[PDB]
Amino acid sequence: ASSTAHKQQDINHLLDKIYEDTKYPDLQEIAKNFNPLGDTSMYNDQGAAAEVLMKELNDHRLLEQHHWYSLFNARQREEALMLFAVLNQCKVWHCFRNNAAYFREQMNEGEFVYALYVGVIHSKLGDGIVLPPLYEITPHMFTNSEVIDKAYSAKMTQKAGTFNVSFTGTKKNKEQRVAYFGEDIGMNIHHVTWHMDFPFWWQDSYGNHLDRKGELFFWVHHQLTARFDFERLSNWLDPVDELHWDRIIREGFAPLTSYKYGGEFPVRPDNKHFEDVDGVAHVHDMEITENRIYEAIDHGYITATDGHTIDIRQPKGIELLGDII
């Protein structure tokens, strides 16, 4: 029941054809009849997390299915983490499986996929499971619009096919020379999995501490940056400049990619100045935040909420900077 074979098959089934109601009769039956609140002894918190999520569901406060999802959207992230919190409290696999099946059919698919992945990664119940590659679970997030269009045409015409992916832009765009780095599907899996392993929303009340996370955050991104610059050097290009909030972003981008639901990803023109983003931040807020971080660095200490100093002139200083940055 909780053998590796059954848990793996359950996860495979839950992630199969994620944009449609489940086609597996056993999962259909669970989603119809299981009650996340029916027996709260299955949870290490006696049902607190399930109560939170069920109240949001019953009050019609959750993001609808067939809608874009972004982990950087505060409310959508909070909704995905409500499901993660339920899965994380499950004592045994049948709780994990049944809640996953129940909420798969109620919740936005992007939120669901995210919660199930981090639930598997951060629960002991997920030990031994191999998560399918996200580029086959949500291929729109890893595949350009031209190839997706060819897939839609194959499906409309009921014909199989294999379609070649090319890079975006043209040869006139020198940045295309290094598209094989940031568009590589495995490099993108590396990146999302690092953040799934070391999420910025992690709280140790979820079960365990993530050792040196803030320093690993610095290091993994330093390595992405240094590796990209090595590809630029390999292709007769100069190193990337750094962004600054008061200077133009020289290199624009046309993704030529689309969401499954939500439309095409937006383009950014060349040589644009940063503008304030309504509901996110003013450009000036970013500059102030940057200044405050540099104040801590140049002071040698981070300032606590009550004004006391937290020394960063020690080996953990870089980690604490990762935490606040």
Add this chain to the structure above:
Amino acid sequence: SSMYSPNAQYYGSLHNTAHVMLGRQGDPHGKFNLPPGVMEHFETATRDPSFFRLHKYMDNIFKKHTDSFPPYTHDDLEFAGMVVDGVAIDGELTTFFDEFQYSLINAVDSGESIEDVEINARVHRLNHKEFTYKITVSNSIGSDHLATFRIFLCPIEDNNGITLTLDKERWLCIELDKFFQKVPSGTHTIHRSSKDSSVTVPDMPSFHSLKEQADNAVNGGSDLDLSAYERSCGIPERMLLPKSKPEGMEFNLFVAVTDGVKDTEGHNGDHDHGGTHAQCGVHGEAYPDNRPLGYPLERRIPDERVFDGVPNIKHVVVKIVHHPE
């Protein structure tokens, strides 16, 4: 900043870095193989007009601090029993340009075994005629007292013909002299020659003159009183006065006579302080004047009545005429 800075990691080095920032604006990215700018050497920095824009900027930083203190009171400023009865000058205040020569021999390449030839530059330089201050004081204490004589030249009007208040003059005033002298009981006239200013030093002796004097002593044996030359730090004597105009300009000559016993406490009054202690201090000794630099003009003077009520402070109108060729 200097190595005396308590916190260079945080406060950096505003002024020295600004010298380089300015100096490098002709080649800020090192594309052109240009050497450092004139601002990157103390020999040359004042040749650049931007020197004075940078240093006014810096001066205003200091001024925010000095302006933050409470204005001096009558009791702060009064040298009890010491009144300046009059201030006058023996000799007209006259500026002119004359000619000065120096050798270029070190700039040219010689040798080996080929003789040298005399090669000189002739420059036109500001100069002024000799004068002597006549400062009449009355010491109405029954004892001789050490006094500090502080002499400033202040503008009366700006370039628009607008009469300046004392508060608007004080930061524009230039130091002309500072000296310590015992004032005997009674009414006496203090004489001070322009040549003896503690702000200025004479023109440097030429390299040729130094060689001749040193060679004449070594080849023979003669103890020359080399303890004659001032120092090389100090406003050149020839530049003591502003150029002024051929039609003449009027200025305020400001004299403050302060308690020399308190001003020199810890450094004696009868001691020799050299010829340039006002801005260049005393070689190998502590600075001989305990007062803030710029005393008593370095704090705000919102109420001119305060200064007018202090008998040991007096200013008089003097005229400086430029004599063109």
